Each structure stands twice: as C-alpha cells, then as structure tokens.
Design a protein around this ligand. Structure first.
Ligand SMILES: CC(C)C[C@H](NP(=O)(O)CNC(=O)OCc1ccccc1)C(=O)NC[C@H](C)C(C)C
Ligand SMILES: [Ca+2]
Ligand SMILES: [Ca+2]
Ligand SMILES: [Ca+2]
Ligand SMILES: [Ca+2]
Ligand SMILES: [Zn+2]
Length: 316
C-alpha cells in the first residue's frame, strides 16, 4: 500500500519485545519498506484462502496474543533478507528484490509451514506438537530458502534432489539463526516444537539419528512416504554440512572443520552455480567440491574437508 514508513513495537511468539517496520495509511500495516521492494505480512484468519488480508493495526503496537505470530513472521523475514543481502550479495529470493509475502494464522491447529510457490505460509500449531511456527527464526529462514532454491537450482521436491532441497533450507535456516545470534544451535525448530518437552527439536543436523533420520547414505530411506523421504534423507546432507563446519569423526572418518561462514559460501555457490533440478547426492558432492575449489583452491583445506565430510556420510 502507499503510505509512510513507520516503526511499530510488539511481542513475538516467545514473549520477546521487538521493533517492526510498518507502513501508515489510516492503519498501520505490516509492510516493511526498508528492504527491497518490501516485506508484507498477512492475516489468513484461521482459513486456507491465501494470502488473506494485509495485516492492519490501529495503533502500531503489536502486543496482543493474536499479533505474536505476525510480529515474528515479519521480523524474521527481515533478518533473513539481511542475511542473504549482507552475506551473499543476494537481493531477496529472486535476486531482484522481489516482494516477500507471508501469511500467518493459516488454517486451524496446523502443524506445518511452507512456501506455496509464491509466498510463505505459517500454521499456528495445535499447541502440542507446535506453537505458532513463525516463532522459530530457523523455520522462517527455512521457508524463505525454499523460494531461493526454487529461483536458482530448482531442485525437484522428491527423492534425492528433494532431500538436498530440504537440507539447503535447514542449512541456511541454521546459518540465519547463527547470524541473528540468539540461542543459536544446529537443531531445527526447537523454539516452536513440543512446548511440553524441553530439549528436543524437529530435526538435528549435528546428530540426525536422535530424531530418527539417517546420518549415512547406507541408512537412506527408499520408500515413497514424504515425497521419497525429503525430510528424512535430508539428515545425510545436514550431517555432512555440520561436519564441514564443525568437524568431527563420524563412522571412523575424521573431518577438519572450516567454520560456518565457509560452509555458507560453499553451499551458496553450489546452490546458485552448480546444482540443477535433478541433482542427486553424488552430484551435490561434486558441486560442493567444485565450489570450494573456486573459492579456496584445489589444494586447500576447505576442499579436503568437503571431501572428508561426504566420505563420512557415505556419499561418493
Ligand atoms: C522447518 C519446519 C518446522 C517446517 C518444514 N516445512 P516445509 O519443509 O517447508 C513443508 N513444505 C511442504 O511440505 O511443501 C509441499 C508443497 C509443495 C508445493 C507447494 C506447496 C507445498 C518441515 O520440515 N516440515 C515437515 C513437517 C513438520 C513434518 C515433519
Ligand atoms: Ca495494536
Ligand atoms: Ca536455537
Ligand atoms: Ca535452531
Ligand atoms: Ca520442545
Ligand atoms: Zn522444507
């Protein structure tokens, strides 16, 4: 909408106060004009029609319980935009400052979030498996990263290419969580998963097997559930990425860690210059090796560590 840029204040899902970029024209809208061609947050009003209505507020204060998922979807989309721009010189998900749109309060009791081809969508959860999913910065960045993937490598959402797609979203979701630097970890969704159970999470990158997911290619899922295991077999790639960054010895194979920033550079380059819609795990290894070679040189520690990490998870 046309209006003047304003700064509201409110409280997110976890009860924390933050400032939000809004737009004033009669109402204050969740429209952040400070980033690209805007970040826009919508109310889906417990229904499934999308996007719903651009979020309007009378007083620019967002402290109601109903407001909290909107505050966080809007704010964490901003952090994610900043990560991609500042760290990777990428302007929004399309590289040309496309407007970023999110809807909250999608459906009833909805234990998921997704990119629908055009926008991000967040359930409120049922209060048992999840609380409103935009409360997790890793979740928000996971969703926006699906848009980045779709505009770049275009990894088809099934089987190995789909597990790579998933892992890319978990990797960058985690790197954004570290960028913001509030309780960062290598777990996925811990801030919004199972409010009645402390210390768990939806997935673990450091130890995927803790939550049932494979940590070696010989343990990959080969059935048809979950689009051929895209949220399951992502553990193999998540583990490789964790090892590249942090190091470790896994099934007897030692990996020298190179840190998060270099992990992000290698995987961003692989995603944007080498992967294709049909890439499989072996092709991801090759893309990561080539990316590290371009950035650091063929004789570098970085290349050696990429190879060790893929060896450790059984991907040749
Ligand atoms: C980080 C998590 C908290 C959220 C993350 N959501 P996602 O991967 O973006 C789900 N997208 C999805 O299914 O897209 C299917 C599709 C395809 C095209 C258009 C529309 C939709 C996830 O890991 N979900 C898994 C469930 C909880 C179960 C486990
Ligand atoms: Ca208000
Ligand atoms: Ca965390
Ligand atoms: Ca996390
Ligand atoms: Ca929990
Ligand atoms: Zn996903």
């Amino acid at each position: 909408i046309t209006g003047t840029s304003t700064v509201g204040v409110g409280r997110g899902v976890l009860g924390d106060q933050k400032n939000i970029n809004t737009t004033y024209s009669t109402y204050y809208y969740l429209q952040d004009n400070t980033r690209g061609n805007g970040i826009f947050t919508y109310d889906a009003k417990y229904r499934t029609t999308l996007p719903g209505s651009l979020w309007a507020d009378a007083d620019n204060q967002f402290f109601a319980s109903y407001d909290a998922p909107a505050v966080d979807a809007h704010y964490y989309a901003g952090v994610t935009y900043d990560y991609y721009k500042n760290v990777h010189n990428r302007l929004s998900y399309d590289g040309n400052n496309a407007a970023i749109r999110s809807s909250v309060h999608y459906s009833q009791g909805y234990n998921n979030a997704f990119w629908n081809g055009s926008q991000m969508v967040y359930g409120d959860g049922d209060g048992q498996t999840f609380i409103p999913l935009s409360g997790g910065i890793d979740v928000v960045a996971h969703e926006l990263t699906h848009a980045v993937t779709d505009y770049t490598a275009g990894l088809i959402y099934q089987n190995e290419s789909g597990a790579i797609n998933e892992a890319i979203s978990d990797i960058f979701g985690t790197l954004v969580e570290f960028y913001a630097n509030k309780n960062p970890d290598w777990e996925i969704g811990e801030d919004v998963y199972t409010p009645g159970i402390s210390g768990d999470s939806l997935r673990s990158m450091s130890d995927p097997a803790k939550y049932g997911d494979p940590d070696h290619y010989s343990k990959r899922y080969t059935g048809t559930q979950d689009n051929g295991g895209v949220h399951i077999n992502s553990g193999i790639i998540n583990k490789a990425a964790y090892l590249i960054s942090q190091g470790g010895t896994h099934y007897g194979v030692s990996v020298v860690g190179i840190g998060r920033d270099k992990l992000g550079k290698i995987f961003y380059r692989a995603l944007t210059q080498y992967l294709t819609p049909t890439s499989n795990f072996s092709q991801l290894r090759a893309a990561a090796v080539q990316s590290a070679t371009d950035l650091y040189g063929s004789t570098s520690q970085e290349v050696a560590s990429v190879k060790q990490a893929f060896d450790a998870v059984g991907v040749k």
